Each structure stands twice: as structure tokens, then as C-alpha cells.
Motif scaffolding. Structure first.
Motif, PDB file in Angstrom:
ATOM      1  N   UNK A   9       0.837  -1.188   0.000  1.00 53.96           N
ATOM      2  CA  UNK A   9       0.000   0.000   0.000  1.00 53.96           C
ATOM      3  C   UNK A   9       0.881   1.250   0.000  1.00 53.96           C
ATOM      4  N   UNK A  10       2.160   1.032   0.268  1.00 51.29           N
ATOM      5  CA  UNK A  10       3.115   2.127   0.302  1.00 51.29           C
ATOM      6  C   UNK A  10       2.564   3.310   1.100  1.00 51.29           C
ATOM      7  N   UNK A  11       2.182   3.022   2.337  1.00 54.06           N
ATOM      8  CA  UNK A  11       1.639   4.049   3.210  1.00 54.06           C
ATOM      9  C   UNK A  11       2.768   4.766   3.953  1.00 54.06           C
ATOM     10  N   UNK A  12       3.991   4.380   3.618  1.00 52.82           N
ATOM     11  CA  UNK A  12       5.161   4.976   4.243  1.00 52.82           C
ATOM     12  C   UNK A  12       6.408   4.188   3.835  1.00 52.82           C
ATOM     13  N   UNK A  13       6.402   2.910   4.185  1.00 60.37           N
ATOM     14  CA  UNK A  13       7.521   2.041   3.863  1.00 60.37           C
ATOM     15  C   UNK A  13       8.818   2.682   4.362  1.00 60.37           C
TER      16      UNK A  13
END
Length: 13
Positions: A9-13
Motif C-alpha cells: 500500500x506504500x503508506x510509508x515504507x
């Protein structure tokens, strides 16, 4: 253990 769905979801990574 399986920690998936949290790095697709690449909410931060």
C-alpha cells in the motif's frame, strides 16, 4: 509468520 499486505500500500515504507 507472514506479514504481507502492509508493504503493498506504500503508506510509508
Amino acid at each position: 509468520l507472514s506479514g504481507a499486505q502492509y508493504q503493498q500500500h506504500g503508506r510509508a515504507l
